[PDB]
Design a protein around this ligand. Structure first.
Ligand SMILES: OC[C@H]1O[C@@](CO)(O[C@H]2O[C@H](CO)[C@@H](O)[C@H](O)[C@H]2O)[C@@H](O)[C@@H]1O
Length: 228
């Protein structure tokens, strides 16, 4: 597994090399990539290839201030673009994203919200929106959850966390909470129910956005402007 080749294939930004290159030495990464490629040859896999690692482009590893974990990408064309929860700018926010934006609006009654659900602005500001499974077969939710992305992604998050003391993690729902278990004494770990529409627990009362900024300030880190 060669870094230059891998980087070129997925248009990965090079600032992430120290965090991702080590993952290429894990024998299981080769298996993951061969299976991902096998899937792309036999299915309409989403998001498009050039977007699978869009999260490496919006900000560098040292700019990450908050990590929000997702599960699987949207499986309808035109929705997913490589970031957890986010959808392309011309797509009315699906239920889970609508729920997240509503909590944001409840936390910040004055925020000037655009009404769209493209979280590129958050990503550029260092809010890492990462799915534990990066791809999916069109029309079949979570269809790629067993191909190996979760270990690769978890590895990257682990290296990022060791490199960076003081991160805020927002772990929403069971799956997110089981996949990433950051040292609570080194990082601010915030848990909540799932913004997924299947949850019968309202996501609207989530105050993580406010809690996160108070934490960042105690660590002399600039707060996040959550408007979007
Ligand atoms: O439902 C109206 C409106 O309420 C919001 C804001 O809290 O979310 C609630 O309702 C959803 C179902 O429509 C739930 O899935 C969600 O958990 C709950 O907080 C908005 O998201 C929604 O537009």
């Amino acid at each position: 597994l060669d870094w230059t080749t891998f980087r070129r294939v997925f248009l990965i930004d090079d600032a992430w090399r120290p965090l991702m290159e080590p993952e290429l030495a894990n024998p299981l990464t080769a298996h993951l990539l061969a299976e991902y490629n096998r899937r792309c040859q036999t299915e309409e896999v989403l998001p498009p290839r050039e977007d699978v690692f869009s999260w490496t482009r919006y900000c560098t590893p040292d700019e990450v201030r908050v990590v929000i974990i997702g599960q699987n990408p949207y499986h309808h064309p035109g929705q997913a673009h490589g970031l957890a929860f986010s959808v392309r700018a011309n797509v009315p926010p699906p239920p889970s994203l609508r729920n997240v934006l509503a909590a944001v609006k409840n936390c910040y009654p004055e925020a000037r919200m655009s009404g769209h659900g493209c979280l590129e602005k958050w990503a550029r500001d260092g809010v890492l929106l990462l799915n534990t499974t990066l791809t999916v077969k069109r029309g079949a939710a979570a269809s790629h959850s067993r191909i190996g992305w979760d270990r690769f992604v978890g590895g990257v998050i682990r290296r990022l966390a060791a490199r960076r003391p003081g991160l805020v993690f927002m772990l929403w729902g069971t799956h997110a909470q089981n996949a990433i278990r950051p040292d609570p004494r080194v990082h601010c770990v915030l848990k909540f129910s799932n913004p997924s529409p299947l949850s019968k627990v309202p996501f609207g009362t989530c105050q993580h956005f406010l809690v996160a900024n108070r934490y960042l300030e105690t660590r002399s880190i600039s707060p996040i402007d959550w408007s979007v």
